[PDB]
Design a protein around this ligand. Structure first.
Ligand code: TTP
Length: 401
């Protein structure tokens, strides 16, 4: 059985994280998204895995994934439909979207046993975003309704398919279309008139990593569900630990440090002295958290350092970031309203009263920097000491005012 991961999306809604990595390499605790997917696939006896990527990202994928075929999507076309056109199979294949996290492989294991075309649907609370699944009387797929702005059903396209080579006959009939785009669900929509498409309801945890605060969402779920309290590191005297704490190998936790779990402390991390890690602190790898630094409900990616006199709450900080002493992130607005975030040029409500900042890779802040709620700082940005970052900062930009 072959599998294809469609990982050639533009990842613009996930900026600034995607300034320096594909969405497929977003960390959930210590491992990137795609590594969970490959793991699940392999667990179900699928070893011939192909990732379809943008040409821009081919190099990045080749360098990270040794036993996986990488194929580039045709340059001149876009969409989930265009991605499968580089998928080479006869006979059938498992197809999965490259930004999906889900809790287990059980459904993939089941779906590959089936002769029929099959799709997984999952119930959301915001179906109007998302492809809604309309079932017929026999509970097979009637049609997929794309972003209706009306809820016919809870049940939406989970982006996990087992499709037969049919699917290409229908991709050729497809006229595409109102987004400038070749859409897989359009082809599926034709095919389901002629062929039976089973729908299997996914029951566990599912989430697409679409927007930056979803990085916090999934990492919080993973910490609660996938790992157990352990200490493989070095914890000095007078460190207080409550609740579930994962201390990975080579992590060092100095005296005066206070930890209220659940907290994930990635390998090679250096904590303290006199740090405060609050619930849902996730330090992916090789992180430094120093004296009079408090972290709460944040994901702080590989090699990033917050060495002095800082508060980081409800935030995502990408890799190799350095915070000057006294850099502070606000997570609550003066008017205490839902924090809005600029996402692909639209002002989007995050759904969160408390939300901090989203910091791209290799950013450095000068001392005493102030960052407002919902702010995005582009990768490689440099923030002048004492600056008040009251708006988004572009990729690679110096910011003073
Ligand atoms: C998954 C996938 C998406 N796409 C395209 C179709 C759309 O233009 C866009 C939407 O996919 P989405 O899953 O909606 O998210 P995204 O990362 O791809 O896009 P965005 O910039 O909005 O964050 O990406 C591909 O070209 N190839 C692919 O393999």
């Amino acid at each position: 059985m072959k599998a294809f991961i469609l990982a050639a999306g533009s990842g613009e809604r996930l900026e600034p994280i995607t300034h320096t990595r594909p969405k497929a390499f977003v960390p959930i605790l210590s491992k990137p998204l795609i590594e969970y997917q490959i793991e699940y696939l392999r667990k179900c006896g699928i070893r011939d895995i192909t990732v379809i990527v943008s040409s821009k990202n081919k190099e990045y994928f080749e360098k990270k994934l040794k036993e996986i075929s990488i194929v580039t999507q045709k340059d001149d076309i876009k969409g989930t439909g265009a991605a499968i056109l580089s998928a080479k199979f006869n006979d059938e294949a498992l197809i999965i979207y490259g930004d999906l996290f889900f809790s287990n492989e059980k459904e993939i294991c089941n779906i590959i046993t089936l002769k029929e075309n099959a799709i997984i649907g999952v119930k959301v609370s915001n179906p109007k975003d998302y492809g809604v699944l309309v079932l017929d009387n026999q509970n097979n797929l009637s049609k997929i309704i794309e972003k209706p702005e009306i809820p016919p059903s809870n049940l939406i396209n989970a982006g996990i398919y087992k499709l037969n080579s049919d699917i290409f006959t229908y991709l050729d009939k497809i006229s595409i279309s109102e987004r400038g785009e070749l859409e897989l669900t359009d082809a599926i929509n034709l095919m389901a008139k002629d062929h039976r498409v089973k729908v299997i309801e996914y029951e566990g945890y599912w989430m697409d990593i679409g927007k930056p605060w979803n990085i916090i969402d999934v990492n919080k779920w993973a910490l609660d569900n996938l790992v157990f309290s352990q200490n493989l590191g070095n914890v000095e005297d007078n460190v207080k630990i409550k609740g579930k704490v994962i201390i990975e190998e080579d992590a060092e936790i100095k005296s005066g440090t206070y930890i209220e779990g659940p907290v994930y402390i990635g390998k090679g991390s250096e904590i303290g002295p006199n740090s405060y890690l609050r619930p849902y602190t996730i330090l992916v790898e090789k992180n430094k958290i120093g004296a009079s630094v408090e972290v709460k409900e944040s994901v702080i990616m590989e090699g990033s350092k917050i060495p002095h006199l800082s508060y980081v709450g409800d935030s995502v900080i990408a890799e190799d970031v350095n915070f000057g002493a006294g850099t502070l992130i606000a997570n609550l607005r003066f008017d205490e309203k839902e924090v809005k975030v600029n996402v692909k040029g639209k002002r989007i409500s995050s759904g969160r009263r408390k939300l901090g900042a989203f910091i791209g890779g290799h950013v450095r802040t000068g001392i005493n920097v102030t960052i407002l709620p919902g702010v995005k700082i582009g990768a490689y940005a440099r923030i002048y000491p004492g600056a008040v970052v009251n708006r988004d900062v572009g990729y690679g930009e110096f910011f003073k005012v």
